[PDB]
């Protein structure tokens with residue numbers, strides 16, 4: 266089923282885009298939890314990490330490499346936290362795989 | 378020594394004990410000694426990478442493999458209601474061991490924000 270992130274990929278609703286390529290999109294989160302809080306998502310609709318296939322390995326790693334490169338470009342020189350949520354207990358809010366990157370403040374422990 | 382001399386390199390080489398869940402030629406999954414959830418484990422590469430901010434472009438498949446292994450281990454451990462994956466970078470991220478590691482936390486409701 267389509268999600269709001271599909272609409273963002275298709276440019277049907279606005280988002281503040283940080284980076285795009287042929288296979289992923291990075292954009293600022295609409296409900297930021299840190300001074301910098303953005304998402305990196307694949308253009309392929311994988312609904313949740315639990316259903317990712319083995320052949321998706323390089324794509325998932327691509328999200329992390331894009332995320333760390335975007336974090337550097339956004340000035341997160343003191344560090345950041347990357348998060349993927351799965352399901353109800355994980356607090357997943359949109360059923361399209363999305364890598365959160367949060368920084369610009371001290372991130373605390375436990376991570377939720 | 379392959380893997381480095383952080384605690385995680387020692388664990389990779391069986392020089393310090395750990396409760397191992399899964400092991401292959403690229404990574405190792407093992408339980409966290411200070412769990413923050415009823416199930417809390419780590420997935421680490423066997424290749425030493427100090428932190429995600431210095432990972433190389435050719436590390437993409439390895440980093441993705443950590444997540445695939447993480448989700449497969451989570452299923453094997455019965456985390457059917459979900460879980461959260463975390464990577465900490467640098468001081469603001471809360472990094473304390475400079476060997477890349479992916480946390481998997483589940484068995485309770487995780488809250489927002491994630492720290």
Ligand SMILES: Nc1nc(=O)c2ncn([C@@H]3O[C@H](CSP(=O)(O)NCCc4c[nH]c5ccccc45)[C@@H](O)[C@H]3O)c2[nH]1
Pocket residue numbers: 374384395396407408409410411412419465471472473474475478
């Ligand atoms: N099985 C096992 N054996 C060990 O010898 C050992 N030593 C550390 N750890 C666990 O590694 C995990 C990952 S380190 P990180 O850089 O993501 N910082 C994570 C927050 C953080 C900042 N400072 C800290 C101090 C203590 C614990 C966590 C913290 C932590 O969650 C340790 O618990 C171990 N696990």
Ligand SMILES: [Cl-]
Pocket residue numbers: 350356357358359363
């Ligand atoms: Cl989410």
